Design a binder for these strands. Structure first.
Lengths: 182, 59, 142, 126, 263
RNA sequence: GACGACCCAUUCGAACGUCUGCCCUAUCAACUUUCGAUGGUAGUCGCCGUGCCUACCAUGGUGACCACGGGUGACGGGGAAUCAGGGUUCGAUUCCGGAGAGGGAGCCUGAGAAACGGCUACCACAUCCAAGGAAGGCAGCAGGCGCGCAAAUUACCCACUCCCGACCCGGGGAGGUAGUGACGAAAAAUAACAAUACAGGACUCUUUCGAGGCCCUGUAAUUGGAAUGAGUCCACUUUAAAUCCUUUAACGAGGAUCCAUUGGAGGGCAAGUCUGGUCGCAGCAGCCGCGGUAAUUCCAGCUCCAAUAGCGUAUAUUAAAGUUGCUGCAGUUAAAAAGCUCGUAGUUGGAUCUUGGAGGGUGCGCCGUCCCCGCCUUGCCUCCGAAGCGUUUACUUUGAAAAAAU
């Protein structure tokens, strides 16, 4: 029954400069709320703290070696991070976009199959998107590397095939009952 | 040192001519509303270097 | 540096600190259990009582108003306490022999504003929320 | 739309007279499948017949067109009827049995306690 | 509490090395009284339905046992929570499988099939060696088996090949510098290795410096050392891994290399 | 193919014994024994150690290195919360150890109980009665009263997880299962895309006027095709049987919705150099301060901000607070060096006793770079191992021993 919080609010609350920054992030990133950003500012701070500790340790130090390499390999599987980075010295010099860039929502834009970070989120939350055998409704997801290619509309949502739409199918029978017969 | 009155208790609330509610619009659901905010604020929002301006201004 | 620096001298430093902690008022309050012993509310956060009478209290200078509190006997320890009645005409809503839920100012036990010797505020009557009453969400039930 | 019943992770378990395995049911695009359809369909892959292929668990996945469950198929209908959870046999038209629902019975027994030995006396009283 | 023997185990307060999940219920099996101490044992139920997957329910584990399907050291055992342990055999017949309970390098009772021979005999570490009643002497092994009339060489900490049908020691190994060893507890639980040194303390506590077939050195308490034969010549099966112990990096190096390609 | 016994060991334990670590307090400084306080010696007792008890016999044992006494929003710990680092605070409460079942005391049985879903007395409470009698203990599960700031069903099941018994089979308010459930934590709906239509800006062309143009955002005009569960619902799944989830045929989005909120907009502080109303009145205002007739603080709207299925308020406590200051405070004048010196505890203490090339870890493409080690007087003696064996420590170093959950 163990549980933990996933976000952290900023010490302080009114620093125009920070607020604007967050708003630009929501906009580019079809985000919903500040928490939506705060959640990531939080995710990142822990990663950076994880990193900083490690970087203070001796290199070759079974603890530093075994966990450093792991943090890196984890950070790379998600594309968040790259090789020269792909050492700890580079994660220290990293940022939020790099995570934010891997969510669904922005990818469904990023290859035509949405044309909007907008469209993207309503598409995702509405069941028209599988990551290869599996519908994924979590506009919040995190697309892994060799998983980038398997993202596509789903086997039945109409695009993806399958009749029309509880509203399109309404319209077909909308030209049927009146204009066909009585 | 207290004596005095209350006769006047609630004098302004009861004298403040009620106002309609009027109405109009719904403002937008979560993230969409955030989106309108970001475009109105930042895209919109081009700004001039007019030495600034405001959010809840009249003339 | 007013404080030995010998490897040994843990006990002197440890104890000298224990001796000076007292002057901290928050600390002393806590160790003497003042909240249990002096305070009208138990060492609790809210407290309910009966209304004895309605007071119009004479706000301190340079301000000038009649304040509007009730005097309340707390059921828990028969303690007598005066409590502010906030918002416009809300006295209205509390009558003698009423019941009421009282709460602290948010001042740490120290009276608020111009309102002199009053350290508490009404929150509920009609068991029923001055706010909901003032708005007219809910009524003076009966 | 055809389906397809796929049996993953097989174990031949002699000491309980049955072959036990996961049941992976594709149903491409609708949902579902009946427990009865599943036992019928399995009955014909393990050369056994329905009444030896109990089937249980089950949760269609996320979004549609698959369902993973669990099955057992018994080497003797006797062996099943005896290694068997009773509630399992009851579920299909071979096992059913008495209810209560439980506190009526406990009450009976507590009434019986009052009475010295005999107790059958307490039976006629309940 | 405080008037008598505990009969329940809150799961979570059970020994980790059974690897029971956290959710499921409140209580773990709790080993019956038997030949192995409760921490250091493996209740059959965990073996039948938690490691071997023969059983699902506990109701099933019982149904299996009442058949008589399963013997420990040769002699049908019919209790759900029987406390089996290190050097025990366990034989399921109408299934033809013989397993010896001996450790992982994790320190987890390992699922270790052994031949249809071997299953005959087990190696017990002498715990005490005794002049019993009427002047007879006896040895006592870890697994709580007392054998009278043993041969006079056998001394505490030596190990001893028991037949098994018959009881009967059918030889022995001395504890001496250079013997092969199995580690039966503590940080090093599961590591196998030669010896090197026994540091001796009066009053209490003797340590055994062990060296593995990789010139990896480590210590444990004498209490934790079990003799299993002569270097390169175990007297039993060893599980895959030869109780080696590999650094978490070495462990990763093996895991990714053996597969997603390498057959 | 269907339990006893003697004695020993074993297993689960038990009962005691070692140290080392605990809150506040000196407006608690001496304490403990003639009803043993500390010790001898012997016995009786106990499962057994032991002033346990008792005789005799000594006169001890403890304290400024805080004893003794008193207090306590003290059950103890694993743990929790607050994150520079140091720290700061909590811990009844899913585990461990301890304690109790109205208060007190006693006891039976049995291997195990000083048991209360045993008993027995008194003491406090309550109940039945034909008035002599008689029967009882929810700090078990539900529920109810009282109490209060505050806390759920008089529901289903032994199928899971395990336990017990003569037991595969029975029994389990252990425990699971549903109901209540914004402690609190996770996922995150209440609407996406063109088009006209327009409103617009970097780009280009032009002497200018003027025109083109990419990137697009709105904003209507309605369109236009493009959509999904929230509800509802054959069927099916879940499971002991159900529910819900996770599953879906048939339905379910043109806004007046299938209708999002709660605080703020004078300063700190994010946001009205508003409009009506009042005129230091009502109210606002943690603090500073507003309102005494052009109120950006009120009262309302309008409009805007902030956090958003959550948000305000009160309160304990923590961070901030280097305002308790080890790290890391101040004390001439701001709050603070005793009038001065002696002085025990405590703390604190000068210099000086041994010198003067390759082995192994991880980076970079057979080569090397950068640690670590015995080297270019270093345990004596007993007489390689063994043993003798340590001058005491603190320290620090390397091991083992180190509950799980966390």
């Amino acid at each position: 029954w163990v549980c933990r919080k996933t976000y952290v609010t900023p010490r302080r609350p009114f620093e125009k400069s920070r607020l604007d920054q967050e708003l630009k992030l929501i906009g580019e990133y079809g985000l919903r709320n500040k928490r939506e950003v705060w959640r990531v500012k939080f995710t990142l701070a822990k990663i950076r703290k994880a990193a900083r500790e490690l970087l203070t340790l001796d290199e070759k130090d079974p603890r530093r070696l075994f966990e450093g390499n792991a943090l890196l390999r984890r950070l790379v599987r998600i594309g968040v991070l790259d090789e020269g980075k792909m050492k700890l010295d580079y994660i220290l010099g990293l940022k939020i976009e790099d995570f934010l860039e891997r969510r669904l929502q922005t990818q469904v834009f990023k290859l035509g199959l949405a044309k909007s970070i907008h469209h993207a989120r309503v598409l995702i939350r509405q069941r028209h998107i599988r990551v290869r055998k599996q519908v994924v409704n979590i506009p919040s997801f995190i697309v892994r590397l060799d998983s980038q290619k398997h993202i596509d509309f789903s086997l039945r949502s109409p695009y993806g095939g399958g009749r029309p739409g509880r509203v399109k199918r309404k319209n077909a029978k909308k030209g049927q009952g009146g204009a066909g017969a009585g | 040192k207290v004596h005095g009155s209350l006769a006047r208790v609630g004098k302004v609330r009861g004298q403040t001519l009620k106002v309609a509610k009027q109405e109009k619009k719904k403002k937008r659901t979560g993230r969409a509303k955030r989106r309108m905010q970001y475009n109105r604020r930042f895209v919109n929002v081009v700004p001039t270097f007019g030495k600034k301006k405001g959010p809840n201004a009249n003339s | 540096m007013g404080k030995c620096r010998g490897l040994r001298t843990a006990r002197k430093l440890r104890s000298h600190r224990r001796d000076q902690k007292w002057h901290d008022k928050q600390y002393k309050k806590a160790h003497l259990g003042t909240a249990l012993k002096a305070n009208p509310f138990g060492g609790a956060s809210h407290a309910k009582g009966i209304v004895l009478e309605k007071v119009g209290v004479e706000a301190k200078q340079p301000n000038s108003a009649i304040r509007k509190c009730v005097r309340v006997q707390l059921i828990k320890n028969g303690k007598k306490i005066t409590a502010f009645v906030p918002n416009d005409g809300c006295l209205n809503f509390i009558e003698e022999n009423d019941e009421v839920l009282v709460a602290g100012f948010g001042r740490k036990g120290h009276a608020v504003g111009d309102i002199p010797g009053v350290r508490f505020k009404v929150v509920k009557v009609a068991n029923v929320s001055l706010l909901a009453l003032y708005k007219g969400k809910k009524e003076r039930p009966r | 739309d055809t389906v397809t019943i796929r049996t993953r992770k097989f174990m031949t378990n002699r000491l309980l007279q049955r072959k036990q395995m996961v049941i992976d049911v594709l149903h491409p695009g609708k949902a579902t499948v009946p427990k009865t359809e599943i036992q019928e369909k399995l009955a014909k892959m393990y050369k056994t017949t329905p009444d030896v292929i109990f089937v249980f668990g089950f949760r269609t996945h996320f979004g549609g067109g698959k369902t993973t469950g669990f099955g057992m198929i018994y080497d003797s209908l006797d062996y099943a009827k005896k290694n068997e959870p009773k509630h399992r046999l009851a579920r299909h038209g071979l096992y059913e049995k008495k209810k209560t629902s439980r506190k009526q019975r406990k009450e009976r027994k507590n009434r019986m306690k009052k009475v010295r030995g005999t107790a059958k006396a307490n039976v006629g009283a309940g | 509490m405080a008037r008598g023997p505990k009969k329940h185990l809150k799961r979570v307060a059970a020994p980790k090395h059974w690897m029971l999940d956290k959710l499921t219920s409140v209580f773990a099996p709790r080993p019956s009284t038997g030949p192995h101490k409760l921490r250091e044992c493996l209740p059959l139920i965990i073996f039948l339905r938690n490691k071997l997957k023969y059983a699902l329910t506990g109701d099933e584990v019982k149904k299996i046992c009442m058949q008589r399907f399963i013997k420990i050291d040769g002699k049908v055992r019919a209790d759900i929570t029987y406390p089996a342990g290190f050097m025990d055999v366990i034989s399921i017949d109408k299934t033809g499988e013989n397993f010896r309970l001996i450790y992982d390098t994790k320190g987890r009772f390992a699922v270790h099939r052994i031949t249809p021979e071997e299953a005959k005999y087990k190696l017990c570490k002498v715990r005490k060696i005794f002049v019993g009643t009427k002047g007879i002497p006896h040895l006592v092994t870890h697994d709580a088996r007392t054998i009278r009339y043993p041969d006079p060489l056998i001394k505490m900490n030596d190990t001893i090949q028991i037949d098994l049908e018959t009881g009967k020691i059918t030889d022995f190994i001395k504890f001496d510098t250079g013997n092969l060893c199995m580690v039966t507890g503590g940080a090093n639980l599961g590591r196998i290795g030669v010896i090197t040194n026994r540091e001796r303390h009066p009053g209490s506590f003797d340590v055994v410096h062990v060296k593995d077939a990789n010139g990896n050195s480590f210590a444990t308490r004498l209490s934790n050392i079990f003799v299993i034969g002569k270097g390169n010549k175990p007297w039993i099966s060893l599980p895959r891994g030869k109780g080696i112990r590999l650094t978490i990096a070495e462990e990763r190096d093996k895991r990714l290399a053996a597969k997603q390609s390498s057959g």
